[PDB]
Each structure stands twice: as structure tokens, then as C-alpha cells.
């Protein structure tokens, strides 16, 4: 149920999508040290050619990372049927990187209604399809 939460802003202006990844809180520890080394992957999906991926820096040893990083995607007409996917991963020195939590927004959803504030981190499948804002609480 409880994978923590992330603070994001996302808006579309002038056929560009702007996303700011501020910080996340209460991430689920996964490493044997009881912390994680989180980074955020941003994609416009579907992305069959794997050309849209961007990512934050990895912050080592925290469950409350503060990235304060901004990204821009140049949009095309076909993006009307795409989603911005936002996934937190755990960078792992000696094993495969581990999924922590995710969400997504309709590119068309964001034109009508920019994202701002706290969001609940969802499981990997869920997060490709929807988002759950956590207003004032
Ligand atoms: Na790690």
C-alpha cells in the first residue's frame, strides 16, 4: 500500500512539457543498510524506440531525497495519446536496480490541468495508467 509520495510540477506550454521533480518522502527501504539510493526516471509512453528517457541524479542513502531537478520534453502531435511516466528506482551497486514507486499523467490531461503538489507512489503497473494526488494532508 504505502510506498511514500513525491512532489511534482508538470505543465504543457508552447508544445513543450515541463516537469519539476522536487522531492520524495517515506520511501520504502530496500537496501541491506535500510535506506535506498533513489533516482527518478521520466518517459513519454509509449516509447517503442526508447528515445524519451530522462532521469534525475541518484541520491545515495536516503528515503527522503530532494532532487530539485527540472526537465523538458519537446512534444509532437502524436503525443496527444501519450502519458508522462514518473518512476522512482533504487540504484543498486551490486544487484539490478529495484522499483520503488510510480505514477503517470495524460499529456492531454496536463494541458487542461497542470500537475502540482503531492502524489501517492503506485506499483509499477498501476503507475503507467493513473495518478492519485494527496491534497492538503
Ligand atoms: Na540501492
- Residue 14 annotated as part of some ligand binding site: no
Domain ranges of the chain: 1-137
Fold classified for 1-137: Immunoglobulin-like (2.60.40)
Question: Using what technique was this structure determined?
Answer: X-ray
Cα–Cα separations (whole angstroms), residue 65 to 15, 23, 83: 30, 6, 24
Kindly write down the DSSP assignment for every residue of the chain, as one continuous string. Answer: ----EEEEEEEEETTEEEEEEEEEESPPP-STTS-B-EEEEEEEES-TT----EEPPP--SBSS-EEEEEEEEE--GGGGG-EEEEEEEE--SSS--EEEEEEEEEHHHHHHS-EEEEEE-B-TTGGGT---B-TT-
How many whole angstroms from 38 Cα to the centroid of ligand 1? 7
Give me 112's grid cell. 487542461
**39 carries a ligand binding annotation:** yes
125 CA to middle of ligand 1, Å?
Answer: 21
36 C-alpha to ligand 1 centroid (Å): 5
Resolution (A): 1.9
User: How many whole angstroms from 106 Cα to the centroid of ligand 1?
Assistant: 30
Cα-to-centroid distance, 29 and ligand 1 (Å): 9
Contacts of 112 (CB under 8 A, 6+ apart): none
Enumerate the β-bridge partners of residue 118: 7
Amino acid at each position: 500500500e504505502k510506498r511514500g509520495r513525491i512532489y511534482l510540477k508538470a505543465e504543457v506550454a508552447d508544445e513543450k512539457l515541463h516537469v519539476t521533480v522536487r522531492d520524495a518522502k517515506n520511501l520504502i527501504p530496500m537496501d541491506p543498510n535500510g535506506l535506498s539510493d533513489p533516482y527518478v526516471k521520466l518517459k513519454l509512453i509509449p516509447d517503442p524506440k526508447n528515445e524519451s528517457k530522462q532521469k534525475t541524479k541518484t541520491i545515495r542513502s536516503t528515503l527522503n531525497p530532494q532532487w530539485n531537478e527540472s526537465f523538458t520534453f519537446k512534444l509532437k502531435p502524436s503525443d496527444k495519446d501519450r502519458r508522462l511516466s514518473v518512476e522512482i528506482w533504487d540504484w543498486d551497486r551490486t544487484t539490478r536496480n529495484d522499483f520503488m514507486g510510480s505514477l503517470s499523467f495524460g499529456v492531454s490531461e496536463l494541458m487542461k490541468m497542470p500537475a502540482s503538489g503531492w502524489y501517492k507512489l503506485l506499483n509499477q503497473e498501476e503507475g503507467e495508467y493513473y495518478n492519485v494526488p494527496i491534497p492538503e494532508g
